[PDB]
Amino acid sequence: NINESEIIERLNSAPSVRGFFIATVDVFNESIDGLIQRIFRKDNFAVQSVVGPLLQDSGPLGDLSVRLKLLFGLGVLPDDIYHDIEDIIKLKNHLNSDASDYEFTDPNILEPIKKLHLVKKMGMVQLEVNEPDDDIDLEFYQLQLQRQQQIIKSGLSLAIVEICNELGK
Amino acid sequence: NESEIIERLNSAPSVRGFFIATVDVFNESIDGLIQRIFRKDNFAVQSVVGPLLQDSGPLGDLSVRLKLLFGLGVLPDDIYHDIEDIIKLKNHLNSDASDYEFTDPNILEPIKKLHLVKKMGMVQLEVNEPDDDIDLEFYQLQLQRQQQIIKSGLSLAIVEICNELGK
Prior knowledge:
CATH topology of chain A: Four Helix Bundle (Hemerythrin (Met), subunit A)
Shape of chain A: elongated
Largest sheet of chain A: none
Radius of gyration of chain A: 19 Å
Order of helices and strands of chain A: HHHHHHHH
Oligomer: homodimer
Number of strands of chain A: 0
Number of helices of chain A: 8
Largest interface: A-B, 19 and 18 residues
Structural class of chain A: mainly alpha
Helix content of chain A: 55-70%
């Protein structure tokens, strides 16, 4: 349970969508930084004297996105993982450029998340929406809509958790 | 391979000329290394790898791309430093309005400092003069002889380095 419950606890904690996505790229960031470090000899102080700078923020390999391209290019990440992470990073940036807030139930969020290889792998679960003159009562109309969101977000969180597990092997 | 590059180092008319050809050589040898160490197939991969490697890309640079090859464990310490070291030097030269000569100290000392020139075996020195004048003829001709062997020595180092880069 450990590692997983930690990070998914962390994702729950995220109050908002923008909050959420920030936390997940952060999560990935740490997760591939554990990898980058497993491939550049953890140790020689001589060798870290090249590598450290290479990988610092200001360095040519400072940035998460480039760090992905490398690992992918280098035959270390699988296609499907390379794309998913990239796709999520790119989504976070969009939202972070966007003045309007969105919800996990919204087309321009939900649809991105469907395209993602890993939700295609794990399949997905969604609560049926509000329809006029269907059984749903309007006093609950709202709490139910929150509840759709928490379902979607949780599926996503499981995807993310899976992804970090692969990155860990 | 081994030879059409001894011709390159040869046809170089000058210290500056020499070092420019020699990092060109380093540049293309290491290119083909870097290239084989990366995935080199699928469009999607060549779609990511293409631009990563190209010049404006993060791995555009030679020296960046040596740095990474070293950190991956691919290049031995000795050869990383030597290439790096010879690069510092070509650049030095390329920023310096003064022409030097292989027997000049700012030039020969750092070349004697490389791991291969110590290791393959081009080791010596030579007193600075000439004694007076009525002597500059003779002395010119010894220098001329030394330059050409120090030139040759480094050339051995360089072509060796390259034959490792491919191996």
